[PDB]
């Protein structure tokens, strides 16, 4: 659901539901054409699938492949409220992150019982 | 009943969640929906439920 | 995992009802003296 | 989890299936106890009459 | 008097005069003459019993109020106002609030049912004016053991006793219930479906959204 | 003869090798699932994060533990007091990562011991005896409930419950001392008195009874063989034992109504354990023991240490070290 719909819901109606991690959708494809000096007030990065580089043999040959993996931490992974200044050097948009909740501790478990913790971050 | 009457028409009771801070107010519109009232009685006693 | 919840909810209500209706079946009469 | 919840039924299936166990017990209990209205023993925890 | 358990009833209230004879008569207006009050078609003959006349009064009121109950629910729930009028949505199905339904409906159908109950009471008086002895609520032929209409009443005298009990009780309780529903709707401007269905629901203010969980 | 009747009868039968009863219908499945899960988890449970800081702790035998170091680690601090059954996790692996088996085992164990009390009473009723053994068994049940359920309720997290293991038990006791001062609480004193007195009275009663045993055996045969099951006379002489006890301490001071003696035997440890469980329960809501810190002051004002201040020193030493990475702010609230 979009941000205009979540803002209608009160905090009591949301607690526990698990939609605090979800990212609001956007409808109505259009062009913004940002004015120089503007910036992104909010930014949510939600991972939908995780994979770890591993070695596995298909038909007697092993190669670097990214194997899927289920997340052990419950509902922590999503980042939100990232802010950064958009600029235009040669007519190119540059995000340049500046501040906001951008790290998130996350642990994921590979096939075979291997646990791989990592810091899902967007910094600098 | 006497407690309800005191809270509704006999000067009211102290309410922390009152706008502008905690103060004595009259509870004009109590919730009478059986579902919301018995949701407390029939909910879990564990964390997050109470 | 909804199936597992269904099976456990059965087992629990199964045994709890067994208890409740076993103690309702004239238990005080069950006793050495009559 | 912490979603309040009447009892803890979240899916109509869960309620409709926690149903037949209790009703099965009610039926087996009714099998012995049926057509009982009177027979007041009037004694301290006697219930001698079946 | 077991109804009014720690109290005495009329010096001559009966226990077998009417089925509903538990003794409940605190002011017990039964004592009073209860005659052709303001010339209520005075007869001075059989004249039933003054108590039995009050009994016929309670019977008429409770029967009408019993029908009134169903006429306060079925317009909403049962048949959802099958007004199915050829035209004119107002004065038809649309007004599901019973008070507003009366507010709309033209005097055509009002005079229809008025003349209906008018012929009803005309036949009732035609019986009772002659039906002395046991006026028996001006029974006449109306579903009597002779059953003046279809499925002519086919029951037993003990079943008849129980049936008299059924009718009398239901009429009294419905006399309560009609008051109930009427004061309800007037003091809520709605129909019984409205308050009862939001009651058996969960308020929109709190729903814990939905299980949008992963 | 109906089916229900027949059943009810078999259930409440007193001729079954083990009494089932109606409380057994709750005791048996619950205790059986608790012990099955415990046995499996003690052998092959993966590590669990207990303080919720993504630092899992191993407690299984197959993860480099022994019998003493192994334990069933309590649930994660992130969960807190929330209910965490299997079906609320997205995967069984995740359920194991957050210490769900601890919650499962502890809840089932508590229900099982309550049903065990009920079953004790039920058999007492069936056999036509006086129904108060389960009252005596209430004391260990109360202690287990206080240590496993009431303390997590007061503290606000299941991670604060006693881990199911040896070294985990010692860790729980030490942290309890550091954060609560259990030793200086009068209820713990009452419990230590009750346990020491229970041991004392058990040893003394056994010695007095066995010492005065009627000679009905040779020397090349166990003294215990003199007694025969289902006797009609006392195999021991109360008169001699009471004479010895009275001469040992004092004449007035002595029990004669053996019934009063056995009632006192039952009363002492039971009330001690009840008072101790109440100490734990009261201290779960932060009503700690006496704090006689810097109570003695000389004329000038300087502080003179007592034996309590060294206890405070040891408590500080334990406190600044427990859960080293969990804290971010000066106070432990
Ligand atoms: C129009 C209303 C009306 C009228 C005229 C009467 C009239 C009478 N009632 Mg009655 N009654 C009514 C409504 C009415 N009742 C209602 C709504 C109830 C339900 C509370 C009762 C319950 C009731 C009882 C329980 C008894 C009466 C009795 C009586 C009689 C005295 C008299 C025939 C008494 C009676 O008939 O004894 C002879 C009696 O015992 N009534
Ligand atoms: C056709 C006109 C008419 C006439 C002549 C009577 C005549 C009478 N009614 Mg009656 N009544 C009528 C219409 C009429 N009613 C209608 C339309 C309703 C509705 C009632 C409802 C009614 C009740 C509820 C009672 C009477 C009673 C009585 C008797 C007093 C008397 C015989 C009383 C007996 C009594 O209690 N009537
Ligand atoms: C005392 C009895 C009584 C009275 C005075 C009315 C009176 C009325 N009914 Mg009604 N009704 C009754 C009993 C009664 N009804 C019963 C018992 C039923 C169930 C079969 C209905 C079912 C019913 C329907 C389905 C409709 C009415 C409608 C109407 C109105 C024309 C009028 C106000 C109509 C209306 O205006 O709404 C309409 O559509 N009635
Ligand atoms: C509980 C339902 C019930 C029962 C069992 C009876 C039973 C009986 N009624 Mg009765 N009756 C009822 C409701 C009932 N009535 C209602 C709602 C009305 C109003 C339409 C009437 C109107 C009525 C009349 C007018 C007469 C009976 C008669 C009889 C007879 C028999 C004892 C007859 C006596 C008779 O003539 N009934
Ligand atoms: C006497 C039998 C019995 C009882 C009482 C319980 C009780 C319980 N089991 Mg359980 N279990 C049993 C046998 C039993 N088990 C058996 C034989 C198995 C093997 C298949 C399991 C396997 C099992 C698993 C795998 C899990 C449980 C879990 C649970 C807990 C939550 C269950 C729940 O929400 O029920 C809901 C039932 C109802 C709401 C109906 C009861 C309604 C009446 C009115 C009772 C009201 C009680 C009220 C508080 C007083 C609860 C303590 C869960 C757990 O421990 O989570 C930590 C869990 O994950 N059980
Ligand atoms: C000489 C020194 C001394 C002594 C005598 C004690 C004595 C005691 N301490 Mg202790 N303590 C001490 C020093 C001492 N302490 C120090 C120095 C510290 C600080 C580190 C502490 C910190 C401390 C804490 C933090 C706690 C104690 C507790 C206790 C009590 C133990 C309760 C108990 O075991 O019964 C209770 C019995 C049970 C819990 C057993 C229940 C059994 C269940 C019902 C059934 C189990 C069945 C089993 C699983 C299977 C059956 C076997 C089958 C297979 C055959 C007891 C009074 C505990 C207490 O307060 O009591 C609750 C407690 O929590 N002490
Ligand atoms: C000379 C030996 C001696 C003596 C006289 C005492 C005497 C006492 N101890 Mg003690 N104690 C001793 C050695 C001794 N202890 C040793 C060696 C240890 C282990 C290091 C302890 C550990 C200990 C604990 C942990 C506690 C006591 C407590 C007590 C008091 C009650 C004990 C009680 O009633 O037991 C029952 C005996 C007869 C009924 C009592 C003043 C308890 C108390 O209340 O202290 C104030 C208490 O909590 N003692
Ligand atoms: C009419 C009045 C008569 C009522 C009779 C019933 C009396 C019960 C009234 C107390 C209310 C019970 C509290 C609610 C508990 C509940 O069901 O949810 C409490 C939890 C709810 O369960 C969890 O709820 C969560 C909430 O979102 C999630 O939905 C989880 O999926 C769900 O598992 O259920 C249990 O775990 C407790 C039941 C375990 C059974 C214990 C048996 C005890 C022995 C019974 C003895 C006979 C008495
Ligand atoms: C040939 C012939 O014609 O003879 C006829 C004879 C005769 C007798 C007519 C026949 C019959 C039998 C008949 C007609 C029987 C009819 C009986 C009838 C119609 C009896 C209604 C009772 C209603 C009551 C008691 C009140 C209920 C409701 C009450 C008291 C409430 O509590 C309402 C409540 O609403 C409020 C107040 C508020 C809400 O918040 C809560 C609720 C909803 C709970 C036959 C077979 O047709 C034949
Ligand atoms: C059909 C329909 C409609 C209708 C209608 C109508 C007309 C409904 C009418 C209902 C009606 C006419 C309801 C009467 C109740 C009388 C009562 C309750 C009397 C109680 C009296 C009591 C309880 C007293 C008991 C006593 O003990 C006391 C207290 C003192 C004692 O000494 C004496 C007695 C024993 C007496 C609309 C609205 C027109 C359109 C709508 O669409 C549907
Ligand atoms: O978890 Mn077990 O020990 Ca009760 O205090 Mn806070 O938390 Mn943690 O620290 Mn201190
Ligand atoms: Fe002994």
Short mmCIF file of N, CA and C in Angstrom, two decimals, chain A residues 20 25 31-32 40 50 79-80 122:
data_model
loop_
_atom_site.label_atom_id
_atom_site.label_comp_id
_atom_site.label_asym_id
_atom_site.label_seq_id
_atom_site.Cartn_x
_atom_site.Cartn_y
_atom_site.Cartn_z
N UNK A 20 5.44 -2.72 8.85
CA UNK A 20 6.39 -1.64 9.08
C UNK A 20 7.62 -1.78 8.19
N UNK A 25 4.20 1.50 -2.31
CA UNK A 25 4.25 1.47 -3.76
C UNK A 25 4.00 2.85 -4.34
N UNK A 31 7.09 11.89 -15.02
CA UNK A 31 8.45 12.41 -14.95
C UNK A 31 8.52 13.54 -13.93
N UNK A 32 9.57 13.54 -13.12
CA UNK A 32 9.73 14.53 -12.06
C UNK A 32 10.47 15.77 -12.56
N UNK A 40 16.27 13.88 -1.65
CA UNK A 40 15.34 12.81 -1.32
C UNK A 40 15.13 12.78 0.19
N UNK A 50 17.85 -12.95 -0.81
CA UNK A 50 19.25 -12.95 -0.44
C UNK A 50 19.94 -14.17 -1.02
N UNK A 79 15.79 -1.03 5.37
CA UNK A 79 16.27 0.31 5.66
C UNK A 79 15.18 1.32 5.31
N UNK A 80 15.21 2.47 5.98
CA UNK A 80 14.23 3.51 5.70
C UNK A 80 14.77 4.85 6.17
N UNK A 122 23.98 1.07 3.17
CA UNK A 122 24.18 1.97 2.04
C UNK A 122 24.81 3.23 2.62
#
